[PDB]
Amino acid sequence: IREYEFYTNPRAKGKKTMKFNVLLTTYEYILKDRAELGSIKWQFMAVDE
DNA sequence: GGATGTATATATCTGACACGTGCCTGGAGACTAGGAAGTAATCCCCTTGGCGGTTAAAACGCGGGGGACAGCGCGTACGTGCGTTTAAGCGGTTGCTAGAGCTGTCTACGACCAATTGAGCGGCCTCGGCACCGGGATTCTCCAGGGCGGC
């Protein structure tokens, strides 16, 4: 998911723009991948339950 | 008829009991201070019974070969016994010194107490270094015009 679907230009190494619109995830992968998801300029957060 | 085996009595040896004495250490009596028991408050860790999700460890099965074990041979090294040597064990000399025990004197060193202050613990601000964002320089892919060929 990370290197085939996050970025429009995943093979670059400078500023990588985002490709997806909405990312659905769970709490376990918020805790597991906070380093790879906290460094994203999110426009909206919706926390269910 | 003579000497031998055995029983009872008497003197001597030896461990144990009680008497005597010192002395010094434990006990009795009194006083005091502080160690610890008890109390209240605050805050953080542990308990018991659950749920959810990841995932790597645990469990199970199976094939195969490496290793444990048994047996056998062999040769060597240790046990065994005897004769010989030697040194341990005991008793002994002869002086001097080390050390335990006791008594005595004294002095420097450590306990103790009051005042002081400066080194240890916590937080706060700043720097060294790492990292995020904006701007300039360099290289790669591409769309269109000019020229040539065919019916």
Where are the alpha helices (H) located in chain A, listed in sequence order?
A: 2-5, 27-32, 34-37
The answer to whether A17 CB sits below 7 Å from nucleic acid chain B is no
Block residue for tokens 């085939």: A4
The answer to whether A48 CB sits below 7 Å from nucleic acid chain B is no
A7 forms bridges with which residues in the sheet? A18
How many angstroms separate the CA atoms of A48 and A41, rounded?
20
Q: What is the resolution of this structure in A?
A: 2.6
- The helix/strand count (H/E) of chain A reads as 3, 0
**Which bases of chain B come closer than 7 Å to a protein CB?**
53-55, 132-133
Q: Which residues of A15-27 are buried (b: 16+ CB within 10 A; e: fewer)?
A: eeeeeeeeeeeee
How many angstroms separate the CA atoms of A3 and A46, rounded?
24
Closest CA to A47 of A32, A21, A29, A27: A27
Half-sphere exposure of A46 (CA within 13 A, CB side): 4
Q: Are A36 and A2 in contact (CB under 8 A)?
A: yes
